Write a protein that binds this ligand. Structure first.
Ligand SMILES: Nc1ncnc2c1ncn2[C@@H]1O[C@H](CSCC[C@H](N)C(=O)O)[C@@H](O)[C@H]1O
Ligand SMILES: Nc1ncnc2c1ncn2[C@@H]1O[C@H](CSCC[C@H](N)C(=O)O)[C@@H](O)[C@H]1O
Ligand SMILES: C[C@@H](C(=O)C(=O)O)c1ccccc1
Ligand SMILES: C[C@@H](C(=O)C(=O)O)c1ccccc1
Ligand SMILES: O=C(O)[C@H](O)Cc1ccccc1
Ligand SMILES: O=C(O)[C@H](O)Cc1ccccc1
Ligand SMILES: [Ca+2]
Ligand SMILES: [Ca+2]
Ligand SMILES: [Ca+2]
Ligand SMILES: [Ca+2]
Ligand SMILES: [Ca+2]
Ligand SMILES: [Fe+3]
Ligand SMILES: [Fe+3]
Lengths: 339, 333
């Protein structure tokens, strides 16, 4: 019953106030996640606002504001000094990392809409985001939304991997988790960014896998002009999560996929996971994330393929898709099992 | 609630975030005015005239559409059921997002006490000022002009505290062609903008500016001009005088620095008390949470009513403001 064109003034007032307040609630979800408040609420059902501020050493008036913001749209409820879970708590907390991504991660982009849309401004580095914050969010995005399909694909491999390469390795956690599952395995993380490599190297060394897992800074799109090509022949498992859209547009993807197939000639399975562009969902029925993901990429000047466009590119790129998993639901996102 | 209702509500909160930034942007880019005027627009046409990246332009319009502010029929965009309300309050959205977005984005870093020394938050001064012009004009002007009309005299020299763009002083000089104007602002940027705008409009011989902190108004030098001032105005910054003890002193210093002021017009939003969380009108939560985050005391209306006398002033008229949280204009003597 959602799409009315005629409403009363009172209704229009309430709706616009909700849109306003939703903005603050939205930012609060990620902030409350980061400050530990969503985990307290989830675990205990309630908490005490002063007691929370004191234990975490937080400016109490702003803590009250954070919780009021959440309460303004029904995520929590305030009752005296107490905050209890509200009707939408479970759902909001489920998707907290998407909110964090939207706000803490990509806030500066969407805030700068007026300066980002003008063509005269769209050269070189024209927007800013928070890499540390995006990295914070993506860990849970990876774990909450992609892991079941990822591990289901790893379980149906039909062989034990001995050397695994991961494209866009980020924190290096995927490679670490792999090493945990397959004790004897070696790992190769490829990433185009210095912070990622360093962060990943540190974590790897700290968790005791400095002997099994290494890294190389490189562009996966131009993987054939990298300085670690001699190690590639040993790789029998390839993984690539949350970055496949960077290989687009179509013709670049085709080439990149060919290059990957030639560069990793002994890879058996290649597990490829990403979010994709949706078509024809009504404006008033967009689920969580979809709009942020698509509008964010349009603002950054980055093309996002549909699922159908991935489907249609694998054969030319040298790969056969033998299984596909739908993700629930991070917009329309999937894991392809390629060989 | 059912699980479907919860999904839908959380999706609305997410998309609302995007619609919310888009209101302010659509304002700046001229899309809201064009929609007010014609009732519709063409996404291609608009993108081409404004030389904008069209796929991002469609995004902006689908954000607005996602919550009922507009509706899309292919490339045609028509005003939606919530257009008039949102357009009305567009400056508030702009303020929250383009002005103050970076403060609320950094919530996790701003709340911890160890982080709250020195320059611990950032806002966009240019953007805030952009919004503030319309906030002042749309929300405060009617009460401001009503107070001017009922002053009981015609001013000769007006001083404006936190003068910003200089617009309020310009408009007063338009109403009272013989008036001398003086603007006090703490920001060099405001002083520069105001001097430029005044000089450009032809009022450079009538309106001057001095950089100064209105809280310590007694410490700003102005060639003895303060003593000639017979009308004082201060909009949208009075809460900066607080807490109470500081306000009492600043009020007493203003009284002393401006001995010949007859009326002092003091306009501001205030902290509300007891509004139910799910019934919060537009702005209230942003205004109050923003200042709580910034460490800035915000008084209630009653706190203001209770401070004037000890501050050396008598309140003689009060005006309610329409639909800007709880906002008022006091007239003081
Ligand atoms: N063309 C490219 N080649 C290699 N790495 C890339 C790339 N484009 C982006 N990346 C890297 O891919 C990452 C995107 S998000 C990382 C999430 C990570 N894959 C995970 O599953 O947890 C960033 O670390 C970025 O540096
Ligand atoms: N303590 C202080 N003393 C003087 N000016 C101040 C101040 N605190 C803030 N300001 C200035 O007050 C302005 C707040 S915005 C209000 C603009 C103006 N009064 C109007 O009605 O449109 C900014 O220009 C800011 O620099
Ligand atoms: C990492 C992120 C992304 O592409 C981005 O932030 O630009 C992403 C990719 C895929 C699913 C979810 C988030
Ligand atoms: C300028 C703003 C404010 O207090 C702030 O930006 O800190 C304000 C004050 C009063 C009404 C509306 C906005
Ligand atoms: O065409 C597809 O849908 C997928 O890209 C891969 C696939 C093909 C056939 C059977 C399963 C998976
Ligand atoms: O106490 C008040 O309400 C205001 O401070 C101003 C006022 C007082 C008395 C008569 C009129 C106005
Ligand atoms: Ca409806
Ligand atoms: Ca298909
Ligand atoms: Ca309307
Ligand atoms: Ca303006
Ligand atoms: Ca003086
Ligand atoms: Fe991306
Ligand atoms: Fe303020």
């Amino acid at each position: 019953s959602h799409m009315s064109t005629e409403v009363s003034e009172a209704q229009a007032r309430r709706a616009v106030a909700d849109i306003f307040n939703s903005t603050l609630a939205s930012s609060a979800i990620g902030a409350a996640w980061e400050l530990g408040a969503l985990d307290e609420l989830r675990e205990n059902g309630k908490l005490d606002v002063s007691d929370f501020a004191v234990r975490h050493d937080l400016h109490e008036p702003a803590v009250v504001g954070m919780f009021t913001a959440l309460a303004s749209v029904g995520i929590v409820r305030r009752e005296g000094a107490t905050v209890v879970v509200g009707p939408y708590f479970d759902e909001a907390n489920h998707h907290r990392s998407l909110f964090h991504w939207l706000n803490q991660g990509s806030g500066e982009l969407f805030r700068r809409m007026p300066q980002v849309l003008p063509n005269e401004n769209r050269t070189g580095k024209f927007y800013q985001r928070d890499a540390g914050a995006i990295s914070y969010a993506c860990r849970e995005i990876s774990e909450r939304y992609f892991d079941p399909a990822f591990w289901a694909a790893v379980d149906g491999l039909g062989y034990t991997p001995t050397t695994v390469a991961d494209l866009g390795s980020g924190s290096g956690e995927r490679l670490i988790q792999i090493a945990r599952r397959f004790p004897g395995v070696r790992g190769l993380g490829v990433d185009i960014a210095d912070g990622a490599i360093a962060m990943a190297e540190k974590e790897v060394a700290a968790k005791g896998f400095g002997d099994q897992i290494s890294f190389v800074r490189g562009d996966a799109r131009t993987i054939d002009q990298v300085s670690a090509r001699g190690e590639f022949a040993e790789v029998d498992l390839l993984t690539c999560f949350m970055m496949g859209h960077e290989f687009w547009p179509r013709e670049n993807c085709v080439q990149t996929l060919r290059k990957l197939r030639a560069a990793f000639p002994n890879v058996r399975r290649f597990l490829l996971g990403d979010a994709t562009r949706t078509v024809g969902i009504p404006d008033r029925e967009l689920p969580v994330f979809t709009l942020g993901f698509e509008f964010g990429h349009d603002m950054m000047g980055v093309y996002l393929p549909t699922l159908d466009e991935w489907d249609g590119v694998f054969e030319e790129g040298g790969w056969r898709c033998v299984k596909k998993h739908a993700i629930d639901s991070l917009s329309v996102s999937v894991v392809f099992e390629l060989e």
